[PDB]
Amino acid sequence: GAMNSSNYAELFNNDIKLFVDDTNVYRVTVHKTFEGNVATKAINGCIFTLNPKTGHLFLKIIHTSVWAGQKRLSQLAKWKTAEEVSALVRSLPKEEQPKQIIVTRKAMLDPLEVHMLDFPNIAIRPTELRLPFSAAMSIDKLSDVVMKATEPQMVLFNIYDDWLDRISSYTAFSRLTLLLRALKTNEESAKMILLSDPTITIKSYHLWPSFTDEQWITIESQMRDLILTEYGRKYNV
Amino acid sequence: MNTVPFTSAPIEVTIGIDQYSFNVKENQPFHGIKDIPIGHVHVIHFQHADNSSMRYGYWFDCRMGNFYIQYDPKDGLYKMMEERDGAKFENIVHNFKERQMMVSYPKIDEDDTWYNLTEFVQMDKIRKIVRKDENQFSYVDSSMTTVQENELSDPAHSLNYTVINFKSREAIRPGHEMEDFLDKSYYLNTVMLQGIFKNSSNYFGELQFAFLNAMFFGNYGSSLQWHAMIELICSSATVPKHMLDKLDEILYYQIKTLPEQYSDILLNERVWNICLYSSFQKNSLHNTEKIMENKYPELL
Numbered sequence: 022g023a024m025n026s027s028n029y030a031e032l033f034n035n036d037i038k039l040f041v042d043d044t045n046v047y048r049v050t051v052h053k054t055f056e057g058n059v060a061t062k063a064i065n066g067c068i069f070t071l072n073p074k075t076g077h078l079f080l081k082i083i084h085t086s087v088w089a090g091q092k093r094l095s096q097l098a099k100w101k102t103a104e105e106v107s108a109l110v111r112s113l114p115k116e117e118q119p120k121q122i123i124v125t126r127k128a129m130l131d132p133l134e135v136h137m138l139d140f141p142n143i144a145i146r147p148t149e150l151r152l153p154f155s156a157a158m159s160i161d162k163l164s165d166v167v168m169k170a171t172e173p174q175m176v177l178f179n180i181y182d183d184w185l186d187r188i189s190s191y192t193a194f195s196r197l198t199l200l201l202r203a204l205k206t207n208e209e210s211a212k213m214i215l216l217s218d219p220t221i222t223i224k225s226y227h228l229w230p231s232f233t234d235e236q237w238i239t240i241e242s243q244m245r246d247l248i249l250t251e252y253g254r255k256y257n258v
Numbered sequence: 259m260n261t262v263p264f265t266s267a268p269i270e271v272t273i274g275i276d277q278y279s280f281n282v283k284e285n286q287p288f289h290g291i292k293d294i295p296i297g298h299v300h301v302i303h304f305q306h307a308d309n310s311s312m313r314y315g316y317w318f319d320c321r322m323g324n325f326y327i328q329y330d331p332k333d334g335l336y337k338m339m340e341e342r343d344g345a346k347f348e349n350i351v352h353n354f355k356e357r358q359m360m361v362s363y364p365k366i367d368e369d370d371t372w373y374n375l376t377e378f379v380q381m382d383k384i385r386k387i388v389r390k391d392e393n394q395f396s397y398v399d400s401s402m403t404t405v406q407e408n409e410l411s412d413p414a415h416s417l418n419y420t421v422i423n424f425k426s427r428e429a430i431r432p433g434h435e436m437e438d439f440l441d442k443s444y445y446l447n448t449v450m451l452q453g454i455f456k457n458s459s460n461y462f463g464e465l466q467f468a469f470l471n472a473m474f475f476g477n478y479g480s481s482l483q484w485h486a487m488i489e490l491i492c493s494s495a496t497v498p499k500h501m502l503d504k505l506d507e508i509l510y511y512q513i514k515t516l517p518e519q520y521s522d523i524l525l526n527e528r529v530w531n532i533c534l535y536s537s538f539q540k541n542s543l544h545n546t547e548k549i550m551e552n553k554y555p556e557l558l
């Protein structure tokens with residue numbers, strides 16, 4: 022059924038699964054019109070579809086043209102997400118298709134269930150975890166490819182870089198969620214922490230630097246401090 | 259006017275005939291119900307005094323044969339039987355009427371309630387939902403499960419209602435997923451009406467039969483069927499005007515007849531609030547919405 026803290030380790034077993042986050046599919050800026058009314062302008066978005074065991078991020082870029090002439094866009098966005106995830110599953114060989122898809126928001130259950138009726142053996146699951154995947158657009162290279170897109174496009178990045186050569190997928194997911202939680206709570210500071218040392222380069226093909234094991238410990242501690250810091254600033258603690 | 263004689267009443271039982279219920283005491287000189295209106299299906303149903311478990315009963319149409327009730331002390335229930343000897347039957351009834359051993363179907367003349375509850379219900383369609391082809395009447399009890407319930411266990415004893423599943427490949431056209439899920443008109447009009455039921459009368463007949471089974475037997479599966487068939491119409495943006503007007507009348511009389519004190523065991527809060535207040539047809543069921551709001555405003 023639902024994915025929570027009791028069954029957290031199931032994410033890293035050998036049954037293929039994907040997380041789907043739709044919080045950046047339909048993105049707008051709100052502005053005033055010449056007549057003093059309010060209007061929205063859509064900007065490019067993305068579906069965040071992640072294998073938490075391997076780090077494979079299948080980033081489907083949602084170009085603003087898909088909204089043209091459509092109504093009820095927040096509702097359409099959930100069905101467009103489900104359509105694209107179903108299309109991705111069908112494109113994958115049978116032995117690569119997921120056994121479970123975990124949606125980060127419960128409003129995705131029915132749209133994805135309906136689009137996946139042809140796959141009765143794939144379980145569609147919600148989660149009780151509050152995952153910080155909305156902050157994926159705070160990863161500079163991901164935000165860049167989304168904003169530059171002139172047409173629908175799928176892009177592939179490993180969201181763990183080469184970490185799995187040295188750590189397990191449990192630890193890698195934990196690092197990722199800590200980095201994203203920090204970028205979500207204070208993006209400026211988080212980015213300051215990550216690139217304050219010009220000798221650790223963010224490598225061309227990597228989202229975060231080439232930190233050594235010891236440097237990741239320092240980074241991870243600085244990120245917890247930031248999260249705790251912001252928690253205190255927020256709540257006056 | 260037709261008659262269903264009883265051989266005897268050896269165990270204390272509440273007997274119902276359509277919307278009327280009455281008590282028969284153990285070994286009371288009861289020998290049936292006379293003056294049953296011709297032209298309608300009817301249901302004669304039972305709840306034993308010593309075990310209110312298993313309400314059960316029989317759907318029948320006196321035009322299709324001569325039927326009587328006889329208690330079976332081995333299987334412990336009142337059974338419907340057909341008498342093939344016409345002159346034997348007429349002679350039996352006449353003696354029981356002369357001795358005034360039969361209660362009278364008490365049809366008030368102003369009253370169209372039973373017609374309005376069974377307008378589209380036909381014996382031939384009942385007998386396809388309830389499969390026991392050697393009899394002209396159909397047995398139903400509270401515990402019988404529907405074909406759907408058994409997909410999700412004895413098939414000879416099932417209620418074969420038409421399966422209605424909103425998240426099913428039958429309900430959803432490849433490539434129209436959002437369209438078909440949010441507006442169920444394709445499923446209602448093409449799959450169900452044109453395809454399975456053939457016409458709205460047959461659809462309403464199954465809807466009305468499901469309600470009556472749910473209310474008279476407290477059959478949970480029947481209740482699920484009734485609400486599913488309501489929701490399918492209310493959740494369709496394109497419904498013929500005559501179907502909406504007839505549905506409003508059908509539901510009005512069903513809600514009017516429901517025992518006030520069973521509205522917790524026969525009415526689904528989600529379906530009714532959705533149907534009356536959120537659905538495409540939220541404004542098309544004026545009679546049903548008014549009686550619901552005045553009779554069961556808690557549920558809403």
Ligand SMILES: CSc1ncccc1C(=O)N1CCCC1
Nearest residue numbers: 076077078079113117177178179
């Ligand atoms: C970053 S996506 C990725 N990464 C490394 C190797 C393959 C893929 C990929 O597109 N995949 C499609 C199904 C199997 C994996």
Ligand SMILES: CSc1ncccc1C(=O)N1CCCC1
Nearest residue numbers: 275278279280291361362363364
């Ligand atoms: C067959 S109706 C019947 N039978 C036996 C005793 C009374 C009635 C009767 O007039 N009824 C009207 C209200 C409920 C029952």
Ligand SMILES: CSc1ncccc1C(=O)N1CCCC1
Nearest residue numbers: 472473475476477478481523524
């Ligand atoms: C009309 S459904 C009904 N009627 C009378 C007694 C019980 C029920 C009921 O809610 N049920 C739910 C589980 C099976 C039975």
Ligand SMILES: CSc1ncccc1C(=O)N1CCCC1
Nearest residue numbers: 404406407410422423482483486
């Ligand atoms: C006719 S509705 C029905 N019938 C029998 C068993 C379950 C249901 C039911 O409520 N369902 C909800 C989703 C699909 C099944």
